[PDB]
Description:
This is part of a larger assembly, with five copies of chain A, one copy of chain C (319 residues) and two copies of chain D (290 residues).
Chain A: H1 38-41
Chain C: H1 3-11, H2 29-35, H3 46-52, E1 71-78, E2 91-95, E3 107-108, H4 110-118, H5 123-130, H6 144-149, E4 157-167, E5 172-182, E6 194-198, E7 202-204, E8 216-224, E9 231-237, H7 241-251, H8 253-262, E10 275-283, E11 289-294, E12 299-306, E13 309-311, E14 316-317
Parallel strand pairs in C: 7-9
Antiparallel strand pairs in C: 1-5, 2-3, 2-4, 4-5, 5-13, 6-12, 8-9, 8-10, 10-13, 10-14, 11-12
Helix pairs in contact in C: 4-5
Chain D: E1 4-8, H1 12-19, E2 25-27, E3 34-35, H2 51-60, E4 63-69, E5 73-78, E6 85-88, E7 102-106, E8 125-128, H3 129-151, E9 167-170, E10 173-176, H4 192-216, H5 225-228, H6 246-267, E11 273-279, E12 284-289
Parallel strand pairs in D: 1-3
Antiparallel strand pairs in D: 1-5, 2-4, 4-5, 6-12, 7-8, 7-11, 9-10, 11-12
Helix pairs in contact in D: 4-6
PDB class: viral protein
Keywords: portal vertex, catc, tegumented capsid, viral protein
Entry title: Epstein-Barr virus, C5 portal vertex
Amino acid sequence: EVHHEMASIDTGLSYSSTMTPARVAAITTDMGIHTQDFFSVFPAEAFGN
Amino acid sequence: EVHHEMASIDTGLSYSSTMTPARVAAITTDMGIHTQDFFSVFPAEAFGNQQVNDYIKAKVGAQQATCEIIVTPVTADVAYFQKSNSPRGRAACVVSCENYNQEVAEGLIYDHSRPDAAYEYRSTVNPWASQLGSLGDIMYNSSYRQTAVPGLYSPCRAFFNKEELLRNNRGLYNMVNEYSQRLGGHPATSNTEVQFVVIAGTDVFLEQPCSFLQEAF
Amino acid sequence: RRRLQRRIAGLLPPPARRLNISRGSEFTRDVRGLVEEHAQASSLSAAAVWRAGLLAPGEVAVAWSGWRPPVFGDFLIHASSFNNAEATGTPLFQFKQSDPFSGVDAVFTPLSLFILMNHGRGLTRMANLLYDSPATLADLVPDFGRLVADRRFHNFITPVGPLVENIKSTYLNKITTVVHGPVVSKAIPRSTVKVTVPQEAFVDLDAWLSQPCPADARLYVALTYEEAGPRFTFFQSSRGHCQIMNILRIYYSPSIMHRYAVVQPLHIEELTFGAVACLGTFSATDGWRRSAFNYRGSSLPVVEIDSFYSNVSDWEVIL
Amino acid sequence: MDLKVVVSLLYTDEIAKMQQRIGCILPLASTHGTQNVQGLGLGQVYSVPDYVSMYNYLSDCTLAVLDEVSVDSLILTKIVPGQTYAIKNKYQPFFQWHGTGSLSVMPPVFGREHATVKLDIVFPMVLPTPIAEEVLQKILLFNVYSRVVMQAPGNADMLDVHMHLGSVSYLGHHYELALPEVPGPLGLALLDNLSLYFCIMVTLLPRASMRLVRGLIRHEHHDLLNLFQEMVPDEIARIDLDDLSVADDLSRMRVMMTYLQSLASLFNLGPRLATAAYSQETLTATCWLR
Amino acid sequence: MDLKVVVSLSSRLYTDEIAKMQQRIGCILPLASTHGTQNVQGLGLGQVYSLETVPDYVSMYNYLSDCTLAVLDEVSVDSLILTKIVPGQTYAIKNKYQPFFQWHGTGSLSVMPPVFGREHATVKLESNDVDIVFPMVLPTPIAEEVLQKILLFNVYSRVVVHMHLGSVSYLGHHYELALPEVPGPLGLALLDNLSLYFCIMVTLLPRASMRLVRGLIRHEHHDLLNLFQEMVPDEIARIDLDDLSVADDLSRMRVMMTYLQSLASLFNLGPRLATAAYSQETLTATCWLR
Amino acid sequence: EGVENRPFPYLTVDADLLSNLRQSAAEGLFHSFDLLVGKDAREAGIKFEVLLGVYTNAIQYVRFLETALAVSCVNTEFKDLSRMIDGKIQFRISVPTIAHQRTFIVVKNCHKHHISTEMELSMLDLEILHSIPETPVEYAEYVGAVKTVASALQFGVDALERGLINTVLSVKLRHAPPMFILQTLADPTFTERGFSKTVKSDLIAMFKRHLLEHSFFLDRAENMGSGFSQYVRSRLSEMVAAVSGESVLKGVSTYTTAKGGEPVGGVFIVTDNVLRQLLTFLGEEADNQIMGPSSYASFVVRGENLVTAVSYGRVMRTFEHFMARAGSTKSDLPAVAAGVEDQPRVPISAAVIKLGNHAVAVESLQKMYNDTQSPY
Amino acid sequence: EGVENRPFPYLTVDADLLSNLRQSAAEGLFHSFDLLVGKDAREAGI
Amino acid sequence: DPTFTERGFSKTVKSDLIAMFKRHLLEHSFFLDRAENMGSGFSQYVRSRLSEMVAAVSGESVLKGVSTYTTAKGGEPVGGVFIVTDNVLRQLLTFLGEEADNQIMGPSSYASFVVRGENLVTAVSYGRVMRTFEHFMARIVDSPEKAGSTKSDLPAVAAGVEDQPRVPISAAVIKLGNHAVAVESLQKMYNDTQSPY
Lengths: 49, 217, 319, 290, 290, 376, 46, 197
């Protein structure tokens, strides 16, 4: 098992680093219809008969 | 761990070293009167009834210098207590009986057909602590002290026990250097609340001329 | 056949048992060669690794010694099921989850394992300060109440021994615990580690009795079943396991008839009054120095079993 | 120290069959350098099958993982309680292992043909402790329940003892079993004598317990618990005999104590092997002797 | 590692004790501490087993398990060298026990308080005015036989046959052992814990096996059954009236197998020695502390 | 709230870091900050905690010949005490006859003594001892670890040396009968009969006489007015004459008075306060230096001995003197001193008093014992 | 307590400080003191 | 006196030391008035009790290696100093026969221990100043392996007190065996100020 330590310390008081989103590539979930069921979220609750 | 061995060997024939007591720093014993209870010596033995037994046991208070009691009649003259003697009313000397035998030692120390070693005219002073079945042996001799707690330091035990009476009656040089080199006369403790007896050797440091001479002051 | 002489020369020399030193201030090379035990962690250079000798087979030797290399079991737990202000030297307990393919285990330190017992009915102040919600711990066991109710909680938890290193991750915390061996930290200044158990949970069994002293007095854990919620006590003793079961029965003699009086044993499984397990041995002389444990607000009394040697066993039932 | 053991003896399918199990363990005969075929695992004891002799033989000799198989040798290292090893779950009854679970070695109750290599070599089963004790109980009650329905059909039913005995359960793992449905009476089956020990001790337990309580209660009070737990047994087992020939009673007591201790040393599974960190992707686990 | 403990004698030694002790070389001896040098007090079991008439075997077992163990090899005047036993180390243990117990191959040794008389394993050291007794070491089956014979004598004290209980039998020779009358409240506490375990057994004992064993004695006869003399016991008559059900039988066995491990581990009193490779020509074996 | 203000030397960096600050530090963009306005806008006063030096005791080695207890015991460095199971000394004493022969062959045996303490070391300062440093912080750690290990080693041999003095004091106290027996038994007026019964009774009477009259002399040294100095000298002198000096090593010159050729002939071991009292009752002492041996003597096993030692033991002390065998005193004298001679005679600081013709040295050990928290 | 256990160049003087020491520290004559037995008697790490 | 304080301060030695405290209060206190009715042997009694007061002081200063304050005529170190009232001083001087000296040497001006420059740096930055910073540098970053002993570091425990000019100081000196204590009564200082000595 090797080991290595690094010690960062911020020498600028304000934000010194930003991040935009540049371009989309793929919308990896389809904006579709498949709703969840509460029979799997709350399987404990049930009806009378 | 650092180990080290050394082997000494005595070169002079006779004794080459003496210990002398010099000063008394503190009489540590708190010398008063506090007799120990026999009910911690014999917690098992009791009378017939239970409630009168518990009545007496509550009346005397049966629940730091330990005294003991030798029963004596009132006809002992104070002249026996004036000179420093043996407390059992008989001059328990170790050498006016012969060495390295058992007949004449028991004869001088227990038989009363021979008179007392000190006085010319009386066998003993009290007959309740000098007989072979007296009160003193039935209290403090080891032969009748069975089912008794070891670790109590009854002080009167050293004035009576047969093993010391044979141990002292060896050769006198042998007696004195076995008195020095082995501190085991079954003695008291050093600094505890009540006096216990010691078990491990070369840890506490105590000697007694009481088991050497069988006298008292 | 002369090469066999060089082989037996490379194989002969044992560790130095005796050494006739002469003086102390001289500091001879031979006594240094006696006392120099090789290290385990060094800087990364091939000459530095060669002097550290970590490439030697099994045990360390510069190109057996009564010393054992420790093993390091690795665990994964959710970040809320553990507090990063836990001490380094604290014993841990794995609860086996019920999923067949798990990956992420469920480990309870005794501070956290306390709030699996109190909720449902000082030390409890700190246990509620560190792990604030019991609901973040009441779900790692799925069915706690049924499992207490049939008294098969002890055979589901196997002790894993003390903790060493906690890389404080964000979501899935990775901890390393010593299941077996000399408990020593993996730090670049290799600092000593002392196993801590909180004082109110830990009753001595030596001075509870109030000449034979061995060197290895063991440390026992004990889960007990109470009708007022089960308890985790710890035990220090210098006795054999044969003695530990009898003296623990005599120690738990009030609690057994307490549970008998309050709850009659209607079924056949309630009769198990908990179990014990040897957590391992340590030094019987320098044992159990007290210490203090601060969180940001408070301070519980805590014992420190120093230089502990972890060795888990199974569960032997108290009855 | 030196840990290797080179044993002397195969062909290509034997090479493949032994190569299938290069992470499993088996016992030896001695901790020497070279050995023969006969000194290998479970060969001279398992070929009438009987469990208690094989557990005694497994606790008798040491154990060894094997490393490599050549054409005429098997390179294998014996295990010592000093340092740790790396073994594999490469047994055809696949019991999935888990982290910090203690591993056991029981003699093979799952049939000869599963855990074997036909040249002979018989490998012992490796499987964790709660599965071990539960499969011990569920094979023992299967034995006595099979003997009862072979004796009396009206006492139990066959499907009545397969809805609750053909399956073991541990952390959701609902395995099945290869239970011997045709044991055959008068012994002659595996685990035939362990049930025959269990029944004798469960028969002599009333004569033991009543005699012990009546002998302990006269010593008046060391403890209250011997009479405190007089209410928790039924009064049917209380008023049984209180009188027998003390020669016969003493002989029955001595036999029940001996069989009880042997059975209790067997219910402890034997050589307990402790894991540290199991990896199912590699099918390997750190392990050391305990 | 260096494990040498030298014990200094406080006085000299006569030549007869020298000749006696040099015969007693290689035996297992107990120690008070684990330090460098010790005195003659604290060695041996003679401090707790004094020169008396009433023994106490279980407190001797406690003194054996609590303290450490050593072996005596080099003995001379004023000094005798001992070698400690610590877990993690291996040793050679010679067989110098005058009740000559033939050791099984690769079994397991067990230390033992001296059951064969105080005078058998004792050196009288009148020079330091103390006594050293030597604790017996003998194999584990004979160990359990002696221990259960001791407890059965302790429980059949109040009943009466004596020679068939207080005398062990071996393949080598049958021996007699010294029997007290009361072992005090610690022996009564061992009987207390034994009866505790036993009464909870006969609460939770299964009833399928009794229904087996009734028809099994009425069907079959064995050495495992002829102790009943072909007679059913009365609780077999007043217990097997009930029906046979699988679920409560499994729930009974699931606690029975838990309890029997504790009942075995309660008989683990006295340190155990799992040795290996005993040779019948050297009278020694490679042993280590379990 | 987690930040001090001491007047540091502030580096004047010209960044534009002043801009957009107070709206930011109002929201707590930083996690630790303390706004200082007004009279708090000052370089604060310098405050410090003064560390007035660290200190320790240099543990001096109390060498076994550096104390005057070794005048009671001559010694030989024997490099192989592990293989000596037994040592005996034969004494042939010839008793002359007197007109109105006897030989006492007495045997004396040696007895060994083992002593052992236990120093202790952590596994940290062995692994950092074997490793090599490269940065000076690691070098400063390394020199501290080797100082700890050297301290433990020097502590170990020093504790062993103090144990040697303890064993010497114990073996001298073991062969030490009390004062009130050897005050009389050394007086030969009671060994003149031959120890029959009645003279033994008078001896045990005289024991009781001396116990309540002559024990605790130093407590009777305060109530005797100005007659204390002669009383102390008269008691210690007859204690000196109470011990047998008939020893076969008395012929050799072990320790001298460092101012003449006077033998010292005795050693007194007292406590602290007894020493402070005795050096005031006995006035001015004689001297403050005692010539004694600088090293132990040496006795190795040469080959004419070694052949017997490997064959069947029975190794002699002086095989050369045996193989040369009349005899006189001065001819047999150098064979007795088996290496005690020609030592370079380094002085020893110890107090010496004078009782007639014996210049007895007297020393206290409390300066040794009470640095170990063990009772004297 | 207020005791710092960091290593130091401990200046060595010849006065025997330890006249009745362990009884004094078990009685607590000092304001604040640290008894270090065995393994902790080393110089602690920097 | 270590002979009572050797055992370890249990109950049964403190209950003895309380009685020893009371016995020393009942008898040995107020010792100047036991000397006036002593008659003839008063000088021996007072010279005993003063030496008894001296030797029962554990005077192990760590600065005892500093050769400061020796007597003028002989050259012995003055170990210890007495302070009395002036009414008892003349009775002490007549009871102790005569002084052996009328002056003792000693330091003339106070030794100057100032904040040096590296000390000033660590003073500003962390606020923690040691005594001899250059000595710490010599013992750490120059020769750390040099095992410093009593003859090696005795300048370092004496921060300039040893080289400063030794002027006489008028003070009465008595002699108690080997130790030489100097008595002084500063009652003249207070009685001109109307404050209680």
